[PDB]
Design a protein around this ligand. Structure first.
Ligand SMILES: Nc1nc2c(ncn2[C@@H]2O[C@@H]3COP(=O)(O)O[C@H]4[C@@H](O)[C@H](n5cnc6c(=O)[nH]c(N)nc65)O[C@@H]4COP(=O)(O)O[C@H]3[C@H]2O)c(=O)[nH]1
Ligand SMILES: Nc1nc2c(ncn2[C@@H]2O[C@@H]3COP(=O)(O)O[C@H]4[C@@H](O)[C@H](n5cnc6c(=O)[nH]c(N)nc65)O[C@@H]4COP(=O)(O)O[C@H]3[C@H]2O)c(=O)[nH]1
Ligand SMILES: [Mg+2]
Ligand SMILES: [Mg+2]
Ligand SMILES: [Mg+2]
Ligand SMILES: [Mg+2]
Lengths: 423, 423
């Protein structure tokens, strides 16, 4: 079409502007964000090889974005990208960071024409609608301004139009950098929180809890760095380290006459979706010599109930491995009672938020009784988390809560102190 | 832009084709459907008034479709519409029917130019991707073929490319036609199914159940015609008829010494979303002279839990009206236990599907015990629906189910027989 660049087959300037306008009008109607990127090359060649290079650039750019994103060619050495329908500021910001890093990484790679090797460098400017403009020409002014800022900083850079996003981008990249290194140097450590029978007479297991100690940031809370791990391929690899470390710990504790009956590991949504999950778990159980009965997986009702049919199969695979399954944070999500019984699950965990109102919050008291009753109706065992007070414990015990966990019974703890404190 | 028609400001042929292509490539990737319509005018005027008419046509067409749909001008008197991202065949079919009827209705209306009145007529052809083509040129061949079929049938017609859809369209329109008439002539009737205490010693209420008797189709099941009602503005108006009829019935039964303590009415999602719901209910309670305690509303957990924050407010409004609220079909949806307690609800109804497996289906038996236990933990009263057998009843009674309903206790029934059968 007259609307496409004859060489790269990408939309031309006018078509791209129409789609940008459309994306802006729609975003504004749905309270969504749009990312606009401008990209310039210094190249860095031959005439025919030149046009062949632009073609390779184009291919590489298309490969960095999804189905719904547009890549286009403004002219000469300038390309633009459009990432529409981003749910909010932060999704937009992360997706922009991710796409821009991906692009610079792909364009770093050498261009192999005439048998030989060439390099190009790129400068990228990024502007996010609506904040940097909800109108196409303002959004473009600002992406272009960011681009030139990116140039004024040297080779292979991306800048946002907002300084605040540039700062946040730089830090995010450093965090990612540190987390890769954390795994390489082993800066992660496992702490264990003990689990008891409702009376407190007895230790039923330990919940393993990832911590991260960085020399400068100090100790980073799991809630900060875990989501970052899963936003890369890092989490499966960290999960492997963790599972193996807990299995080894179990080994040492048994050797040292510390009778810990089992250990619980939390799983993210990403780990749960992984096709090799059960395979990697079996692999680790085999290396460490520990049986599946010693292990329990903890998944949130949001992870299980989003796609119930898929979850049924994944869970069934894991049970055939002989391991137990607990539904973490229970009561904070949306659950089919139907599938709660069909899923081969073992345990419900009463979220801390409900335990916190005990014993004199009517709402929290009734919700907690209800969970216990559900659990026992489905032959599930339930443990209350976040038990911090004698009164909470009295209530839960009085109403048949099977197991209990919380600061009242001692904080999360490194393995050796754990053994001594609960031997 | 050179891409837009200078007169109507609609996209021109080439731009429309690009968006159609895009919509097809995307639909195919997401397993979605796309609707394409071709529209021709016979007009049916003056030169300046002519161009002003096309402009009015354009405005009218834009007003018939949503934000995301494209309207365009192929040339002369021909326009096209694109309705992308339709979830499946039937959504597509209904949406096409709806949009086409809307367009013919708007174009029926007179054009007021030079002070005077004019009429145009239109022929519409409709083709649905992927079935009538997943490639733009084939989809266009076929919409155009449908259009000419529409012409060969006379004025103001739409045809699908598939004969099967034309048949289904014609029938759907006749159904809609009949339902409007049904309401005008009162062909709807209420049947009532009685509700008892778990023992059976005692009648706690009656669930009202809409039926429709058509002279030719015979008796149409609620599941067939109710969704059609709500796909128009008909359901609020039928709901009003129904509520009023049940309140009147309650009047007569009390007059005639038939002690029916209350009546339950089912609500659709659409009725529930209506801003005037509580207002219209109060209005009807006032006209019929019956107090809110005599009334109970039945809503599905899917209606309540889709938007919990909105539902909380809507429900709170209804409770302030003094009426009771039951969660129908419970166990078949996704529910926050948290919001189950916060929502000011009164009753859970155990779906028939779980009662059906009783008493010897382990899964169904445990689910049903669990619901009863939940209900009583939250101080809710629960009734089992679809109780058909002595064994089912024994089980439910043994486990403290408060109330019961089903064919074992007698089918749904017209009011007067109801009174005599349960006085
Ligand atoms: N207020 C209160 N809090 C208590 C009490 N007892 C324990 N806690 C804290 O509550 C959290 C319980 O873990 P969770 O619900 O699985 O929730 C976890 C889990 O979802 C995730 N997480 C932790 N470790 C891992 C891991 O190794 N892998 C994965 N995939 N996620 C993890 O991060 C979340 C937070 O972990 P932590 O920061 O260790 O926070 C832990 C624990 O330190 C108490 O009595 N009162
Ligand atoms: N297998 C079995 N079935 C039994 C038994 N006892 C009753 N039923 C049937 O099960 C349905 C119970 O109604 P529902 O769950 O509210 O489900 C209702 C309700 O959601 C909707 N509906 C019915 N009347 C109205 C109404 O007036 N307004 C609205 N908005 N929806 C209605 O249509 C659905 C079906 O209504 P019906 O066709 O009357 O079907 C009724 C009733 O005839 C039993 O022992 N065994
Ligand atoms: Mg946990
Ligand atoms: Mg938690
Ligand atoms: Mg009902
Ligand atoms: Mg039902």
């Amino acid at each position: 079409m007259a609307y496409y660049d004859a060489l790269t087959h990408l939309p031309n300037r006018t078509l791209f502007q129409d789609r940008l306008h459309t994306a802006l009008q729609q975003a504004e109607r749905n309270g969504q964000w749009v990312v606009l990127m401008f990209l310039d090359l210094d190249r860095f060649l031959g005439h025919a090889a030149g046009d062949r290079m632009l073609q390779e650039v184009a291919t590489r750019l298309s490969a960095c974005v999804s189905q719904d994103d547009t890549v286009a060619r403004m002219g000469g050495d300038e390309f633009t990208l459009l990432l529409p329908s981003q749910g909010d500021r932060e999704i937009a910001l992360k997706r922009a960071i991710q796409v821009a890093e991906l692009i610079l990484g792909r364009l770093a790679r050498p261009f192999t024409l005439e048998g030989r090797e060439f390099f190009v460098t790129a400068s990228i400017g990024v502007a996010l609608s609506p904040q940097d403009g909800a109108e196409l020409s303002l959004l473009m002014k600002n992406a272009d301004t960011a681009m030139y800022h990116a140039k004024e900083m040297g080779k292979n850079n991306f800048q946002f139009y907002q300084a605040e996003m540039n700062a946040r981008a730089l830090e995010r990249l450093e965090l990612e950098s540190d987390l890769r290194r954390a795994l390489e140097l082993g800066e992660f450590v496992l702490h264990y929180q003990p689990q008891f029978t409702g009376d407190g007479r007895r230790l039923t297991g330990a919940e393993a809890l990832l911590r991260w100690q960085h020399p400068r940031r100090g100790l980073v809370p799991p809630s900060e760095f875990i989501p970052v791990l899963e936003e890369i391929g890092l989490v499966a690899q960290v999960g492997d380290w963790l599972l193996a470390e807990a299995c080894k710990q179990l080994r040492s504790w048994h050797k040292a006459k510390v009778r810990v009956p089992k250990v619980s590991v939390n799983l993210s949504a990403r780990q749960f979706a992984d096709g090799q999950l059960g395979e990697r778990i079996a692999a680790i159980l085999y290396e460490t010599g520990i049986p599946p009965a010693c292990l329990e997986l903890e998944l949130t009702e949001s992870i299980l109930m989003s796609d119930v049919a898929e979850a049924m199969q994944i869970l069934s695979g894991l049970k055939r491995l002989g391991l137990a399954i607990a539904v973490d944070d229970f009561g904070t999500g949306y659950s089919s009672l139907n599938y709660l019984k069909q899923f081969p699950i073992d345990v419900l965990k009463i979220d801390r938020s409900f335990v916190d109102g005990l014993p004199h919050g009517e709402q929290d008291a009734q919700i907690a009784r209800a969970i216990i009753a559900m659990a026992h109706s489905l032959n599930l065992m339930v443990i209350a988390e976040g038990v911090e007070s004698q009164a909470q414990l009295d209530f839960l015990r009085e109403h048949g809560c099977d197991e209990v966990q919380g600061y009242l019974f001692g904080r999360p703890m490194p393995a050796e102190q754990f053994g001594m404190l609960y031997a």
